[PDB]
Enzyme design. Sequence first.
Site, PDB file in Angstrom:
ATOM      1  N   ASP A  44       0.842  -1.182   0.000  1.00 18.56           N
ATOM      2  CA  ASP A  44       0.000   0.000   0.000  1.00 18.56           C
ATOM      3  C   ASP A  44       0.887   1.245   0.000  1.00 18.56           C
ATOM      4  O   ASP A  44       1.671   1.456   0.940  1.00 18.56           O
ATOM      5  CB  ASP A  44      -0.901   0.054   1.245  1.00 18.56           C
ATOM      6  CG  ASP A  44      -1.826   1.246   1.151  1.00 18.56           C
ATOM      7  OD1 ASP A  44      -2.791   1.211   0.359  1.00 18.56           O
ATOM      8  OD2 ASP A  44      -1.534   2.262   1.875  1.00 18.56           O
ATOM      9  N   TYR A  49       3.170   9.916   0.584  1.00 18.02           N
ATOM     10  CA  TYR A  49       4.100   9.286   1.530  1.00 18.02           C
ATOM     11  C   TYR A  49       5.555   9.619   1.190  1.00 18.02           C
ATOM     12  O   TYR A  49       6.450   9.352   2.010  1.00 18.02           O
ATOM     13  CB  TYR A  49       3.874   7.778   1.601  1.00 18.02           C
ATOM     14  CG  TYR A  49       2.501   7.365   2.064  1.00 18.02           C
ATOM     15  CD1 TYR A  49       1.612   8.258   2.644  1.00 18.02           C
ATOM     16  CD2 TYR A  49       2.080   6.067   1.883  1.00 18.02           C
ATOM     17  CE1 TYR A  49       0.306   7.861   3.001  1.00 18.02           C
ATOM     18  CE2 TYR A  49       0.805   5.637   2.261  1.00 18.02           C
ATOM     19  CZ  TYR A  49      -0.096   6.582   2.781  1.00 18.02           C
ATOM     20  OH  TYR A  49      -1.381   6.157   3.093  1.00 18.02           O
ATOM     21  N   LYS A  78      -2.491   6.011  -4.472  1.00 14.56           N
ATOM     22  CA  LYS A  78      -3.612   6.902  -4.170  1.00 14.56           C
ATOM     23  C   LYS A  78      -3.321   8.281  -4.743  1.00 14.56           C
ATOM     24  O   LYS A  78      -2.196   8.798  -4.658  1.00 14.56           O
ATOM     25  CB  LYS A  78      -3.859   7.011  -2.660  1.00 14.56           C
ATOM     26  CG  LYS A  78      -3.731   5.696  -1.919  1.00 14.56           C
ATOM     27  CD  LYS A  78      -4.164   5.788  -0.453  1.00 14.56           C
ATOM     28  CE  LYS A  78      -3.789   4.555   0.349  1.00 14.56           C
ATOM     29  NZ  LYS A  78      -2.341   4.497   0.683  1.00 14.56           N
ATOM     30  N   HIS A 111      -7.565   9.315  -2.478  1.00 15.81           N
ATOM     31  CA  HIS A 111      -7.007   9.148  -1.137  1.00 15.81           C
ATOM     32  C   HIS A 111      -7.967   9.672  -0.052  1.00 15.81           C
ATOM     33  O   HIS A 111      -8.110   9.032   0.998  1.00 15.81           O
ATOM     34  CB  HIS A 111      -5.642   9.850  -1.080  1.00 15.81           C
ATOM     35  CG  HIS A 111      -4.716   9.377  -0.013  1.00 15.81           C
ATOM     36  ND1 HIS A 111      -3.357   9.426  -0.190  1.00 15.81           N
ATOM     37  CD2 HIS A 111      -4.991   8.914   1.237  1.00 15.81           C
ATOM     38  CE1 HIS A 111      -2.839   8.986   0.945  1.00 15.81           C
ATOM     39  NE2 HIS A 111      -3.788   8.654   1.825  1.00 15.81           N
TER      40      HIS A 111
HETATM   41  N1  LIG Z   1      -5.875   5.837   3.226  1.00 18.01           N
HETATM   42  C1  LIG Z   1      -5.488   6.613   4.259  1.00 18.01           C
HETATM   43  O1  LIG Z   1      -5.916   7.751   4.460  1.00 18.01           O
HETATM   44  C2  LIG Z   1      -4.496   6.007   5.198  1.00 18.01           C
HETATM   45  C3  LIG Z   1      -4.316   6.558   6.455  1.00 18.01           C
HETATM   46  C4  LIG Z   1      -3.485   5.937   7.349  1.00 18.01           C
HETATM   47  C5  LIG Z   1      -2.807   4.770   7.006  1.00 18.01           C
HETATM   48  N2  LIG Z   1      -2.924   4.273   5.740  1.00 18.01           N
HETATM   49  C6  LIG Z   1      -2.193   3.048   5.291  1.00 18.01           C
HETATM   50  O2  LIG Z   1      -2.277   2.068   6.341  1.00 18.01           O
HETATM   51  C7  LIG Z   1      -0.944   1.687   6.754  1.00 18.01           C
HETATM   52  C8  LIG Z   1      -0.942   1.234   8.168  1.00 18.01           C
HETATM   53  O3  LIG Z   1      -1.374   2.270   9.064  1.00 18.01           O
HETATM   54  P1  LIG Z   1      -0.377   3.143   9.911  1.00 18.01           P
HETATM   55  O4  LIG Z   1       0.934   3.247   9.235  1.00 18.01           O
HETATM   56  O5  LIG Z   1      -1.126   4.384  10.226  1.00 18.01           O
HETATM   57  O6  LIG Z   1      -0.168   2.405  11.273  1.00 18.01           O
HETATM   58  P2  LIG Z   1      -0.182   0.880  11.846  1.00 18.01           P
HETATM   59  O7  LIG Z   1       0.103  -0.053  10.761  1.00 18.01           O
HETATM   60  O8  LIG Z   1      -1.420   0.731  12.643  1.00 18.01           O
HETATM   61  O9  LIG Z   1       1.013   0.957  12.890  1.00 18.01           O
HETATM   62  C9  LIG Z   1       2.356   1.186  12.454  1.00 18.01           C
HETATM   63  C10 LIG Z   1       3.239   1.337  13.677  1.00 18.01           C
HETATM   64  O10 LIG Z   1       3.253   0.106  14.414  1.00 18.01           O
HETATM   65  C11 LIG Z   1       4.595  -0.349  14.583  1.00 18.01           C
HETATM   66  N3  LIG Z   1       4.597  -1.807  14.482  1.00 18.01           N
HETATM   67  C12 LIG Z   1       4.407  -2.500  13.341  1.00 18.01           C
HETATM   68  N4  LIG Z   1       4.397  -3.815  13.563  1.00 18.01           N
HETATM   69  C13 LIG Z   1       4.595  -3.952  14.887  1.00 18.01           C
HETATM   70  C14 LIG Z   1       4.721  -5.100  15.743  1.00 18.01           C
HETATM   71  N5  LIG Z   1       4.657  -6.333  15.245  1.00 18.01           N
HETATM   72  N6  LIG Z   1       4.937  -4.841  17.058  1.00 18.01           N
HETATM   73  C15 LIG Z   1       5.008  -3.610  17.514  1.00 18.01           C
HETATM   74  N7  LIG Z   1       4.914  -2.484  16.817  1.00 18.01           N
HETATM   75  C16 LIG Z   1       4.712  -2.660  15.508  1.00 18.01           C
HETATM   76  C17 LIG Z   1       5.395   0.363  13.484  1.00 18.01           C
HETATM   77  O11 LIG Z   1       6.766   0.489  13.897  1.00 18.01           O
HETATM   78  P3  LIG Z   1       8.024   0.291  12.906  1.00 18.01           P
HETATM   79  O12 LIG Z   1       7.582   0.637  11.552  1.00 18.01           O
HETATM   80  O13 LIG Z   1       9.041   1.239  13.493  1.00 18.01           O
HETATM   81  O14 LIG Z   1       8.414  -1.163  13.080  1.00 18.01           O
HETATM   82  C18 LIG Z   1       4.678   1.700  13.397  1.00 18.01           C
HETATM   83  O15 LIG Z   1       5.118   2.597  14.411  1.00 18.01           O
HETATM   84  C19 LIG Z   1      -0.167   2.930   6.446  1.00 18.01           C
HETATM   85  O16 LIG Z   1       1.254   2.769   6.470  1.00 18.01           O
HETATM   86  C20 LIG Z   1      -0.700   3.316   5.079  1.00 18.01           C
HETATM   87  O17 LIG Z   1      -0.125   2.436   4.095  1.00 18.01           O
HETATM   88  C21 LIG Z   1      -3.783   4.863   4.857  1.00 18.01           C
HETATM   89  C1  LIG Z   2      -4.348  18.570  11.928  1.00 17.35           C
HETATM   90  O1  LIG Z   2      -4.908  17.706  10.955  1.00 17.35           O
HETATM   91  C2  LIG Z   2      -3.996  16.954  10.223  1.00 17.35           C
HETATM   92  C3  LIG Z   2      -2.656  16.880  10.548  1.00 17.35           C
HETATM   93  C4  LIG Z   2      -1.755  16.164   9.790  1.00 17.35           C
HETATM   94  C5  LIG Z   2      -2.175  15.458   8.711  1.00 17.35           C
HETATM   95  C6  LIG Z   2      -1.209  14.785   7.770  1.00 17.35           C
HETATM   96  N1  LIG Z   2      -0.276  15.635   7.351  1.00 17.35           N
HETATM   97  C7  LIG Z   2       0.598  15.250   6.386  1.00 17.35           C
HETATM   98  C8  LIG Z   2       1.559  16.216   5.974  1.00 17.35           C
HETATM   99  C9  LIG Z   2       2.480  15.886   4.985  1.00 17.35           C
HETATM  100  C10 LIG Z   2       2.436  14.636   4.413  1.00 17.35           C
HETATM  101  F1  LIG Z   2       3.321  14.345   3.423  1.00 17.35           F
HETATM  102  C11 LIG Z   2       1.498  13.682   4.781  1.00 17.35           C
HETATM  103  C12 LIG Z   2       0.535  13.982   5.774  1.00 17.35           C
HETATM  104  C13 LIG Z   2      -0.503  13.013   6.187  1.00 17.35           C
HETATM  105  C14 LIG Z   2      -0.725  11.685   5.743  1.00 17.35           C
HETATM  106  O2  LIG Z   2       0.020  11.153   4.766  1.00 17.35           O
HETATM  107  N2  LIG Z   2      -1.647  10.954   6.372  1.00 17.35           N
HETATM  108  C15 LIG Z   2      -1.762   9.569   5.884  1.00 17.35           C
HETATM  109  C16 LIG Z   2      -2.738   9.394   4.786  1.00 17.35           C
HETATM  110  O3  LIG Z   2      -3.480  10.347   4.489  1.00 17.35           O
HETATM  111  O4  LIG Z   2      -2.715   8.247   4.236  1.00 17.35           O
HETATM  112  C17 LIG Z   2      -2.506  11.493   7.265  1.00 17.35           C
HETATM  113  C18 LIG Z   2      -3.550  10.613   7.829  1.00 17.35           C
HETATM  114  N3  LIG Z   2      -2.423  12.729   7.668  1.00 17.35           N
HETATM  115  C19 LIG Z   2      -1.365  13.470   7.222  1.00 17.35           C
HETATM  116  C20 LIG Z   2      -3.530  15.536   8.340  1.00 17.35           C
HETATM  117  C21 LIG Z   2      -4.417  16.308   9.072  1.00 17.35           C
END
Ligand SMILES: NC(=O)c1ccc[n+]([C@@H]2O[C@H](COP(=O)([O-])OP(=O)(O)OC[C@H]3O[C@@H](n4cnc5c(N)ncnc54)[C@H](OP(=O)(O)O)[C@@H]3O)[C@@H](O)[C@H]2O)c1
Ligand SMILES: COc1ccc(-c2nc3ccc(F)cc3c3c(=O)n(CC(=O)O)c(C)nc23)cc1
EC number: 1.1.1.21
Length: 316
Positions: A44, A49, A78, A111
């Site tokens: 993803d 990013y 996205k 996105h």
């Molecule tokens: N569509 C959207 O608007 C949107 C928004 C948010 C997220 N996303 C996607 O969803 C993905 C996942 O969500 P997220 O990145 O927000 O957070 P997440 O996957 O819920 O959590 C990531 C965090 O958990 C840690 N971690 C991972 N595996 C672990 C384990 N086995 N034990 C302990 N800690 C662990 C990672 O540390 P390390 O990496 O340091 O190991 C990192 O700090 C994103 O990377 C992105 O691709 C999309």
């Molecule tokens: C106060 O309200 C807020 C604050 C921060 C974000 C946010 N800021 C970003 C700024 C730069 C960037 F590259 C990614 C960001 C991003 C970003 O990449 N993500 C992850 C996503 O949208 O997948 C998300 C969830 N948020 C940000 C958005 C709203």
Amino acid sequence: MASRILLNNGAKMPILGLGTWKSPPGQVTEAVKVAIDVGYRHIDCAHVYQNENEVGVAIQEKLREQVVKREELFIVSKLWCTYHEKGLVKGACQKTLSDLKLDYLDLYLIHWPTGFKPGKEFFPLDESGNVVPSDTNILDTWAAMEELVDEGLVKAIGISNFNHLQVEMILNKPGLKYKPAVNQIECHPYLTQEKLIQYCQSKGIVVTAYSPLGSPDRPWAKPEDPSLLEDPRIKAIAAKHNKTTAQVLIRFPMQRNLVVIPKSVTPERIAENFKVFDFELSSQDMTTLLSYNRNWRVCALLSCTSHKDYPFHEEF
Ligand SMILES: NC(=O)c1ccc[n+]([C@@H]2O[C@H](COP(=O)([O-])OP(=O)(O)OC[C@H]3O[C@@H](n4cnc5c(N)ncnc54)[C@H](OP(=O)(O)O)[C@@H]3O)[C@@H](O)[C@H]2O)c1
Ligand SMILES: COc1ccc(-c2nc3ccc(F)cc3c3c(=O)n(CC(=O)O)c(C)nc23)cc1
């Protein structure tokens, strides 16, 4: 647990993928190489990013090493909010394709439903810190996404962070060419998304759960915030299965017929997070985890609450 779910374009999407938000460019190439080595086939990505070139390097290397072929990978990216204008969509997609070193994407998502003023800044601000919107709308952006399928740049299109009414707007669009294949939304035990999941699944839209571990690395976290990975109740469920809390948190959405995309750059955790096909959460475990819902977001897009298309005023 079959490892893929069937989409509306006839393609199969791996239910476990690697997330890449906050995977720093200087660390993410190795993370994606390890992920492919241990079995991940779905990555993803997103332009916002700021690491798609480094993801693309890793993929290229593994293709050249003969570890995987392109058809076995499922690469998602996205369209960022500053590119919702119909005349900007293709260029945004082609920039991701160029950075990723790919000739097509398996899935390309809007996105967020909110369009922002076009320009270099990802979150353009006025002088009082309000996000500057653009004069764009969901339906016109969707039509531009459809063109990407018709030109062969992407195999499927979908949405992310859309509420049910926003999804409905697309479904009911006059002259709809492609239904959304996926809605990617935040989902975890503190935000279980029962109503939106039921809605999407009833419309043949696959749901991907983002931030399944509660995004502890999110940049706005407060120390008093709830923490899934530290929750002793979830730790106890994990201990009973001889698994980690993270493994329980990944298995949970898999048993709801969701796709899930945990992020890590730590090689041991990348491998740990994939080792979720060898156990089952019980009916009681599932019920208990669902009961932890608090309607608590970690990605509430708080700078955009006055945008016409802000998604989280609606209940779902
Ligand atoms: N569509 C959207 O608007 C949107 C928004 C948010 C997220 N996303 C996607 O969803 C993905 C996942 O969500 P997220 O990145 O927000 O957070 P997440 O996957 O819920 O959590 C990531 C965090 O958990 C840690 N971690 C991972 N595996 C672990 C384990 N086995 N034990 C302990 N800690 C662990 C990672 O540390 P390390 O990496 O340091 O190991 C990192 O700090 C994103 O990377 C992105 O691709 C999309
Ligand atoms: C106060 O309200 C807020 C604050 C921060 C974000 C946010 N800021 C970003 C700024 C730069 C960037 F590259 C990614 C960001 C991003 C970003 O990449 N993500 C992850 C996503 O949208 O997948 C998300 C969830 N948020 C940000 C958005 C709203």
